[PDB]
Amino acid sequence: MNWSKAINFQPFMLETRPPLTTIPIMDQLVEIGERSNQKWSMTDRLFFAIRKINPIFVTSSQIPSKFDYTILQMPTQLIASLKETLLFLAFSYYLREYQDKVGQMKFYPVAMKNMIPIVNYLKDRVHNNFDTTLEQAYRQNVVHTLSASDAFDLLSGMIATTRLDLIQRTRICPELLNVLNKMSFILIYAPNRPSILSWKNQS
Amino acid sequence: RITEMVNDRRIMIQKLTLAEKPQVMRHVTTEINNDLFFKMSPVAQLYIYH
Amino acid sequence: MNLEINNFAPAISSIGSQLCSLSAQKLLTCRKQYGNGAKSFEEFYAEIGGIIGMMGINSQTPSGIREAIYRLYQSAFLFGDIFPESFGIQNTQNIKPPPGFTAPAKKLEVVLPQGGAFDLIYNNGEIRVTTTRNVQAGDLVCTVTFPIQGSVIATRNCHVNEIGGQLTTTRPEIIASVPMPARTVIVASFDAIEIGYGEGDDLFAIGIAILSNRFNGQITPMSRHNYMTQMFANLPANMSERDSSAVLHFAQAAPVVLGMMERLTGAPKWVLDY
Amino acid sequence: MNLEINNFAPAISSIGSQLCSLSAQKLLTCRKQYGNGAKSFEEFYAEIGGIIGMMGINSQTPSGIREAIYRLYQSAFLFGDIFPESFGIQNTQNIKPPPGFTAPAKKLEVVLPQGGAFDLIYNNGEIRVTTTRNVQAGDLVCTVTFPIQGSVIATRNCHVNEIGGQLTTTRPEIIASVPMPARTVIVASFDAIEIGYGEGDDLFAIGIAILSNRFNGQITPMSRHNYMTQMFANLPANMSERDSSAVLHFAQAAPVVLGMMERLTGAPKWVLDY
Amino acid sequence: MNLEINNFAPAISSIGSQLCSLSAQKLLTCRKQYGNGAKSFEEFYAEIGGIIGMMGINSQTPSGIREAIYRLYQSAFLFGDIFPESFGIQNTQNIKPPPGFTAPAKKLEVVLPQGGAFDLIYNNGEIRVTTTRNVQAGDLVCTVTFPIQGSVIATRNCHVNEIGGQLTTTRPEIIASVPMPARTVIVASFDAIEIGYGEGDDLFAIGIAILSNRFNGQITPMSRHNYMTQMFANLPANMSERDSSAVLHFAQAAPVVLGMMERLTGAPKWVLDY
Amino acid sequence: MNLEINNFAPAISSIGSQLCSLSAQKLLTCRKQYGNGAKSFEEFYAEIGGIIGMMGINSQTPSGIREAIYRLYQSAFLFGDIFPESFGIQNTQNIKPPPGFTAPAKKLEVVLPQGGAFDLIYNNGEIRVTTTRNVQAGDLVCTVTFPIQGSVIATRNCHVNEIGGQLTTTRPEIIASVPMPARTVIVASFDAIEIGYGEGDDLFAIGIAILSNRFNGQITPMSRHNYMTQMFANLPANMSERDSSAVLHFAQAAPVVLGMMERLTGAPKWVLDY
Amino acid sequence: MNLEINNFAPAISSIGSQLCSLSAQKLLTCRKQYGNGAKSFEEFYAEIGGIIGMMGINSQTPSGIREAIYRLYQSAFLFGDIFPESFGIQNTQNIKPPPGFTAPAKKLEVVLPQGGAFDLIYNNGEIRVTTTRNVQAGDLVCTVTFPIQGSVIATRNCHVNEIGGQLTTTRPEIIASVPMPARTVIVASFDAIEIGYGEGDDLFAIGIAILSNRFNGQITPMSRHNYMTQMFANLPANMSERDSSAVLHFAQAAPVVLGMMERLTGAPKWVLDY
Amino acid sequence: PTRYGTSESIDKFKIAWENVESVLNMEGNDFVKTIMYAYEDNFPKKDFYMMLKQIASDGQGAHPIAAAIDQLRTIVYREPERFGYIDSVILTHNPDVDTAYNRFFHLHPIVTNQPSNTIKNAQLWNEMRLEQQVEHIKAGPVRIIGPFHVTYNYLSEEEDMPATSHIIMKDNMILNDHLTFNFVKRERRNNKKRVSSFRYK
């Protein structure tokens, strides 16, 4: 019976909130970070954007967090790859339009694999070009070198839920369907068949 | 400051536009003790009567 | 006293010190215009002595500024890790230097070598050790762990690095100068200043209990010297000497302001003139 | 019979049961208005047997209801990948309780202990065991695996946990009460109800063959008792007992309605009164 | 289970049964109209359902019908003699006949004659006694104290009064047909209907507890068979067979309706069709 | 009894306690103005008693409040990691302190040292142990694992840390004060209060069964003392005493309010005056 | 005491309790606004403490409430089974539930088996018996005649039915569990609640004298516990727990209110919140 | 008897006396009214009121309408739409139709979404600004609790649907105070056809 048509309350997203007495203080620090440029996007220059992607291992949900800068990981020993990291970054960027600004609690997807080595590797060897973006890197690396099914399997393995679980949860909340459409995914449903996956370009 | 006072009334103020938040204004509040008028005086009966 | 200090401590401490200074100024101003009357001074302060406004805090009661102090103290000295480190390093907003330390160094903290050749007894601003065996001249006998700055006086059978009577290094090391037999004595007196502020120690004693009653598992009543030594030893390894000064100023100013709100006496200069 | 129940089985069952109830109510209305005319009853029902206002049934003929039932059953009990897309399985937050079970427990399933000290034979409503070796009083001799509930008719040389003639737990355990050597016999009878629904046994017999012809690799014809035993054994352990009732209700309603649509007789109360 | 039934019980029972049937009909009508969604079925029943147009009961809440049943049951079977008009119940000779009994006879009750000539054991629908001594044909062995009606099957070594397979009397007595030596056994089986109703045993189990938590000094939880036997053994001697059925129908319907109001499943036919 | 307290328990418990308090206030307000008339008290209550203005309730009947209590309890204490998305838990910025505990400490919980030197028994308000071998004065013989606070009366052959008759620490340890031979007896009585609430125990008894019928696999009926001890033992160590009280208040108030909704008697002060 | 309780005691009690609660609420209402002037509180209460709108009461002074209480008590509990037509009784079935009992069970009432086998001595909350002769395990030792509900603590050398430390039945029986020779002693302590309301014991003592000075032939001054034991012993057998609760509530409230109208202190919660 | 009896302040006597002096001013009560007003000094209004109160308490029966209203108010609770009022309304951007009523209506305003962030009364929503209003809608369905005065229109499939201005977006999303709803009935004439939600949306 555990299921909800709300994107923020899906099994793969974690709710976080500072201690209930330190909430006013953490608001001032978020404004301090807004004064500096402390926000990563998929449209700004990758040279600038990769300087502000610092995933942190989570041990408790009582942690301060900012909507446009925080990405979370759980303590593990597995190592992610470039494609998994790009898929997770795109997922977390397109999943933040539905973030709840009015409330004191924030929801964030967790990364099953360690992305720190890949982020450091990428940061060591990126030049200051005027046109390269994170979305461009995603399109060149994931869309043009993988099938939709393989990329969906990678994304499912990068969050706790299995492939069948994503396909099932996509039918209940339309927000997840929109999020996956933004990542250039297409789902086709036919009777008596399992779902097939395709990129938006080839459909 | 206005929305945080606690009294018998619920004060509601529409949220300020992001641009109109720095706008400056003057609000003078007096800082003086009023407890020195309420002493015992040889003309207190006059105060009561009037 | 167990506690962890994050890397956002200077930013929290600047706001805390500004709040403490504003409250002290408010108290002094309300104190100089108190006319003796039916209303007591405690009632007089509660009515128009807690109403202080600035960025963030918006309370008009002494309980409000007390809770603001509680929030800042918990966020700075007891909360585990506020944010990823790079978020703090890239802060551009700047802070104001705190006043210089004025606490006299009486019980200076030193550690003996692993050998156990010497025995350490303390006095007022003076460390004297005796030799259980014979030891060669020119080796370390004592080193100072608590930072100290000032002049050096009355050194016997030992040598310290000083020019013109003033110490050169913040952590002086005492070395033997002449060969000596067993059961001798070497002394080293100091006219110096340690970390902390000497004034307002009465308020600290009653404010540390107030903020220990709330954080009972983390903070316990103790002396000012021990409190400051533990706070300095619990600072993060990578921090500039400018930020640690602000952190320590707030760490000592919170208890004195808490105790000053209780006993309605004057505030020390290092809190008032921030 | 191999079958894989998914995690959304209660939601599929809540739609299947409603569809079956609506189909049964349409047949009774058709029976009352037949009029004994030139068209046969089978021809009359084919033209007017379609449910109205039901989403996900594309055709207006009983063929559409048959296809919907096939799809729902296949999704619920056979393959976890398929999930029907035209029915309102989105607003399935809460489910309606199904009618209570009414199947008499004639052949009740028990499992002997590993000792091999007893001999199991069956009767109409009672079980009895003969003792191969001398058995000490106060030990388990039998325990049921198919839940039952109801009174106890006659227990000799054995004791069960009952008060006022009513069984306490749904899995009673038979424990010897008196020392009993030399190949004795102990008998226990029950007036109880097993999981299932008694009426519609013929309709189940016709419908199970229809349901098994399509799924020849997963479902084979068998009695209702074996069907229920296997279906209950294949349920997940960590499931609320209210959802299990819905799943087990649909698992029988589907074959019964499939057999009802071929032999145009009445419908059981437990199907129509859902 | 001690209780004193008044002679005005049929008048109270004719109202109680009508209230129960109306509640069951309302439950069915509002149960067929439920769409799965945010509200659970309990909230839906408590809000839109439970509205019956019945005189003398001015409550449209489930709790109101619940305590109407409580009051009617307490008046009819526990207080003692009491006039129906006292509680606003009009007492009228003209009433409706209740539905016929449908309870299957499994543990039929018999009483051995004095002298210890025989020993009795029970089976699913049969009684078997063994002769401890020699007995000549033409004497009683057993007699049913609980009225029974139905056909007789498999009568061995004994004779009963029957024509065409149907028992002539409601209380048959078994008489040995041929003398038997050497501790043989005589068996009498029946296909008969006892006093009570068969459908709805699950609801009775919780309804009896519901009304035993209130009248704990009068009623205790037990099986339906024991409850029916105790109720029947306490009826007044001078009353017709028409009033006895009316009393017993309410006596059994009150627990099952109280249980049905808890678990919002269906209702038995003998409750709805009154 | 297994359960995992989630890390946002105080926020859930604040909403739950406010809901329970509002229900109690509505019950007493309706109870004061019930003028004896045509309708009984329960129809009167079940019609206006559920109209409470609060986020998360999707009904105006007591069934809605019951289901809200079920959801909040499941989210806060049970293994289910379901976050109630329709209440105001996400927008909570501050909590209100709960009323102080008033449960008498009659069966105080103590854990003996591993030596086996002593045997422990219980009395109305004290414990006593008998030495098995010679024990020298100055070592532990007992210590309390369950938090307690209050005064000490009638201590013999043992010393407890206290000033003026008032216990110093919340978990006092009992140590011998006189060297004693084996078989000597020592006692310690306490006039103290344990964690919990003493009033509304019948309501707790009739509500624990109500909430155990639903969560059968996680919660079993028991006494209030055992329930509170298990809840306290399952609390995480990283919890302030102000949050733990807020969790425990709701943990005990949920069964009390659930049983209150059944028997429409009064409510305890610690529930209504939240 | 000698006293006869008629079958309509609940109807009288439901009016007496309402009158007592009204008088207590009026007392607190007048106590809140006492001017504290030259007039004493007794004159203030005598001037404005009356009820003006209740049918049955013929004066607007407190004496009217006193006289009504006298009439109701005499009608409900004394020899004269007089039905008071002056107060308006419309339904003898409708009875608002009274608050649950709060009286701690210190002196529990138990009776010996009549074999002259055990010695009985009492304590604060426990009974303990010594075996005069040899006793085998599994036989009755004691049984309680005053119903009791609560928990069980410190059960040694005996057995009681319990689930999770909570008593199962309201009249527990103590049976030995081990063969115990040579004049051993067994104990049984209960942390339970007897019948009645512990609060307001001072007012009961002064009110029982007030109502015994009038009904001196039937009522004598005594303690609350003995009064309630005899009152419960005089209850009719044909009485449910819902009605006996109201009877006992009025039986205790009448002396408490009579003594409260003399000593104008506060009123207990169980009287105010009826 | 529960409140405002002997302890009531003299300021409350104006309200209580108004009904009595209104009753005394009707036809057929002029003798008692004249005697009462002529000798107010000797027999004041308060003692007269207390005497009448004692007279009424001693078994004087109330007018039957009291019980009639008490019995009718229960009927009012159980069937709201018979008296033209609805307990609450749900404002949402993605509605989910209740399938059970599809059997009877071609299209209906009945949904089954689980609300989030209930709002006490319509006025609070109306006084809000648009930016905060759209944030509420995005997070999910929003519920307005206060009672409303609704009317239902039951229409045939052929008839065109009268327009209802539920929300007027003139400067802020303000709810109307009437909230007329439209049902279109399913008949045996048009039961097998499927009607688009075109005109409705």
Numbering used by the authors:
A (entry chain 1): 1 to 203
B (entry chain B): 253 to 302
C (entry chain j), D (entry chain i), E (entry chain h), F (entry chain c), G (entry chain b): 1 to 274
H (entry chain A): 604 to 804
What does the paper say about this structure?
The three-dimensional structure of the qMCRV was first determined to 3.1 Å resolution with icosahedral symmetry. The map clearly shows an outer and inner capsid layer; the inner capsid layer is a thin shell composed of 60 copies of a VP3 dimer, while the outer capsid, arranged on a T = 13 lattice, is thicker and composed of VP12 trimers organized in a similar way to the previously reported low-resolution reconstruction. Interdigitating these trimers are two smaller densities per asymmetric unit and assigned to be VP11. A VP3 dimer, containing two chemically identical subunits (A and B) with slightly different conformations in an asymmetric unit, forms the thin inner shell of the MCRV. In context, the five N-terminal arms of VP3B form a “belt” around the five-fold vertex that function to link and stabilize the pentamer of VP3 dimers. VP12, the primary outer shell trimer protein, is comprised of a β-sandwich (two β-sheets of four antiparallel strands) atop an all α-helical base. Two VP11 subunits per asymmetric unit are embedded between VP12 trimers and bridge multiple asymmetric units. One of the two VP11 subunits (VP11A) bridges the adjacent asymmetric units around the same 5-fold vertex and block the narrow opening, previously denoted as a type II channel, while the other (VP11B) is located along the icosahedral 2-fold axis and block the type III channel. A striking feature of MCRV is the large separation in the inner capsid underneath VP11B at the type III channel. VP11B may provide the “missing” interactions to clamp the neighboring VP3 inner capsid proteins that have no direct interactions among different decamers.
A non-turreted virus consisting of a 12-segment dsRNA genome, mud crab reovirus (MCRV), which may belong to a new order of Reovirales, infects the economically important crab Scylla serrata. Like other members of Reovirales, MCRV packages its dsRNA segments and a number of RNA-dependent RNA polymerase (RdRp) inside a double-layered icosahedral capsid. Using cryo-EM, we determined the structure of mud crab reovirus (MCRV), a 12-segmented dsRNA virus that is a putative member of Reovirales in the non-turreted Sedoreoviridae family, to near-atomic resolutions with icosahedral symmetry (3.1 Å) and without imposing icosahedral symmetry (3.4 Å). These structures revealed the organization of the major capsid proteins in two layers: an outer T = 13 layer consisting of VP12 trimers and unique VP11 clamps, and an inner T = 1 layer consisting of VP3 dimers.
